[PDB]
Structure formats: structure tokens, C-alpha cells
Amino acid sequence: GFKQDIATLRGDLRTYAQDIFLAFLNKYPDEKRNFKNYVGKSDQELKSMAKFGDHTEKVFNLMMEVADRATDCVPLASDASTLVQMKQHSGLTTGNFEKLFVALVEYMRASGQSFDSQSWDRFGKNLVSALSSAGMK
Numbered sequence: 001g002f003k004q005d006i007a008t009l010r011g012d013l014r015t016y017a018q019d020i021f022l023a024f025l026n027k028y029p030d031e032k033r034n035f036k037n038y039v040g041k042s043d044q045e046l047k048s049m050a051k052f053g054d055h056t057e058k059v060f061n062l063m064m065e066v067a068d069r070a071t072d073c074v075p076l077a078s079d080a081s082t083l084v085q086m087k088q089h090s091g092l093t094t095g096n097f098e099k100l101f102v103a104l105v106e107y108m109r110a111s112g113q114s115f116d117s118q119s120w121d122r123f124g125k126n127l128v129s130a131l132s133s134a135g136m137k
């Protein structure tokens with residue numbers, strides 16, 4: 001289930017973080033407007049860029065902590081307010097997060113592995129709800 005999937009993802013997190021974020025950027029190319037340095041690059045070129053690997057991993061490192069702290073795929077309101085208040089998220093709306101979790105769920109469905117894709121779908125919805133409650137537009 002969800003808790004084991006957090007362990008699976010942490011067991012290879014760099015490669016999952018990069019592959020899911022690439023899935024997101026390829027499915028939603030307009031999302032590169034927040035990553036202007038990632039424009040005009042192939043997947044392999046992005047995987048050569050120090051901040052692509054470093055920032056994506058740190059994003060997924062915190063996503064896994066938020067997932068681990070959740071009850072029944074419902075994140076803590078403290079985690080939601082943190083994600084809202086971060087300066088690096090000043091521009092964002094809940095729609096950006098919805099799209100990421102759509103890409104994460106689709107990655108999981110297409111994988112060879114017994115990921116609890118339904119739990120991740122709930123988590124993404126619960127996280128968007130929590131972000132809205134904590135004041136993200």
C-alpha cells in the first residue's frame with residue numbers, strides 16, 4: 001500500500017524523482033514557464049544539469065516526508081501551510097500540484113510494480129484540498 005510505496009520510492013529516489021518530474025514536464029509542457037532553465041533540453045540533457053538532479057530530489061525528499069506524516073493519505077495541515085508559505089511557491093496555484101500528482105499516478109499505473117496508485121490519487125487530491133485550505137489560490 002501507500003506506506004510500502006513510500007519505502008519503494010525512497011529506495012531509488014533520485015531516479016524516481018527525475019523520471020516522475022520528467023513525466024510531468026513532458027505531459028504538461030507549459031509547466032516549464034516556472035523552470036525557464038529547463039527549456040530547450042531533452043530528458044538526458046536535464047539529467048546532466050546539477051540543479052535539475054539536486055532540486056528534483058529535494059522536492060521528492062520532502063514529498064515523501066509529507067506522505068509519511070499523512071493519515072489515510074491526508075497530509076498534516078502543518079505540512080500544507082509550509083508548502084503554501086515557501087517563497088519558492090509564491091507564483092503557484094493548486095493546479096500545478098494537481099498536474100504533478102496526475103503525472104505521478106500515471107507513472108505508477110504504467111510501471112511494472114504493485115504501487116497503490118489509488119492511494120497516490122487520493123493523496124494528490126487531499127494535498128490540493130489541504131493547500132487550498134492553507135490559502136493557496
Ligand code: MH0
Pocket residue numbers: 031034035054055056058059060062063066083088089092096097100
Ligand atoms: C510545478 C510547480 C511546483 C510544484 C507542483 C511543486 C510542488 C512541491 N514542491 Fe516545490 N513545487 C513547484 C515549484 C517549485 C519551484 C519553482 C521551486 C523553486 C525553483 C526550483 O527550480 O527549485 C521549488 N518548487 C522548490 C522547492 C524545494 C526546494 C528545492 C531546493 O532547494 O533545491 C522544495 C523542497 C520543494 N519545492 C517542495 C515541494 C514539494 C514537497 C512539492 C509537492 C509536490
Ligand SMILES: Oc1ccc(Br)cc1
Pocket residue numbers: 021055056059100
Ligand atoms: O526544482 C523542482 C523540481 C521539481 C519540482 Br515538482 C519542483 C521544483
